[PDB]
Design a protein around this ligand. Structure first.
Ligand SMILES: NCc1ccc(C(F)(F)F)cc1
Ligand SMILES: NCc1ccc(C(F)(F)F)cc1
Length: 330
């Protein structure tokens, strides 16, 4: 079997991408944030504290003939940005673009942090990292991808994120019409539960490529590109007037500047991020200081190839017994 669904930016800055997901019988359609950096499928629901819901579509398990409460199971998650949520667990039927999984763990939020309440466009998250990171207790649960794997034509999914435009998540097949040239595959470490890999180096604009190993994770759930301080300093040094601002919390640059591209290595291949992808607009309405899309990972503890990098490529998440990541230009 296969599945295919369109994913759409939630705002004019590509801060996140939402994908419609059908849950329950009859179907309740929610717009979820597909997150390859986490492994919980959780949703706003009829159980969520009423004051913490502001425009989201909610899952109502009592209206689903296939929902079953998972007795005694709870979940609680904290994301690297300080966001968090928690609740109880149902199993139900979940379908993504024609691909159906029965008995999927659907984690119903009882409590969500402020950053989720204020994001009216995101009804929940669909985690696509490895199931070892799932937070359900006392019985860990599998991700949508792990549950679907056996029935997929090929144990893969692909992310084709658009720049200020819709894109596609495909399950079970690789669309050879969606990219140019060849796909370059690179090894993955699952030791931390992430799609963790090693980039072979970088270049700034038309400058010389620097061969150096950068270990990081492919994370559709993170907006920006977070890289070591040395690399990020080298990039912003090429932008006139750019500086790191402690009050703003990262590199900013004059909105009138043109940004250089950023190249990262995948084996012997190169992925080029156009400079326009790195502009995240004024730091406040009306400001002439703009926020940069490449920031330092120093405070994080891990390098993150977020949407800024992934949307420049066609990305294959190969969940074979030895997992790999594939990158192609598009
Ligand atoms: N997108 C989920 C996510 C968020 C943060 C992190 C961090 F901070 F631990 F790297 C990993 C994964
Ligand atoms: N990395 C997972 C994640 C995705 C989105 C959000 C937001 F935008 F809702 F805050 C938090 C955490």
């Amino acid at each position: 079997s296969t599945g295919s669904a369109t994913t759409t930016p939630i705002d004019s800055l590509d801060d996140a991408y939402i994908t419609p997901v059908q849950i329950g019988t009859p179907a309740q359609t929610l717009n979820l944030d597909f997150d390859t950096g986490s492994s919980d499928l959780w949703v706003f629901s009829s159980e969520t504290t009423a004051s913490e819901v502001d425009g989201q579509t909610i899952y109502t398990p009592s209206k689903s003939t296939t929902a079953k409460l998972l007795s005694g199971a709870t979940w609680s998650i904290s994301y690297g940005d300080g966001s968090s949520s928690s609740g109880d667990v149902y199993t139900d039927t979940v379908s993504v673009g024609g691909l159906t999984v029965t008995g999927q763990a659907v984690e119903s939020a009882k409590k969500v942090s402020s950053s989720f309440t204020e994001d009216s466009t995101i009804d929940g998250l669909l985690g696509l990292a490895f199931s070892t990171l799932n937070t359900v207790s006392p019985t860990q649960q599998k991700t949508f991808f792990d549950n679907a794997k056996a029935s997929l034509d090929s144990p893969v999914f692909t992310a084709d994120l658009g720049y200020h435009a819709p894109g596609t998540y495909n399950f079970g097949f690789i669309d050879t019409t969606a990219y140019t040239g060849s796909i370059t595959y690179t090894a993955v470490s699952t030791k931390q539960g992430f799609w963790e890999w090693t980039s072979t180096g970088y270049a700034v604009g038309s400058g010389t490529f620097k061969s150096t190993s950068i270990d990081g994770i492919a994370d559709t759930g993170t907006t920006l590109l977070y890289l070591p301080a040395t690399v990020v300093s080298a990039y912003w040094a090429q932008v006139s007037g750019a500086k790191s601002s402690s009050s703003v919390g990262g590199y900013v640059f004059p909105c009138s500047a043109t940004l250089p591209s950023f190249t990262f290595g995948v084996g012997s291949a190169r992925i080029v991020i156009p400079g326009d992808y790195i502009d995240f607009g004024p730091i406040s309405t009306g400001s002439s200081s703009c926020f940069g899309g490449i920031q330092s990972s120093a405070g994080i503890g891990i390098n993150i190839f977020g949407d800024v990098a992934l949307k420049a490529a066609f990305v294959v998440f190969n969940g074979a017994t030895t997992p790999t990541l594939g990158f192609a230009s598009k």
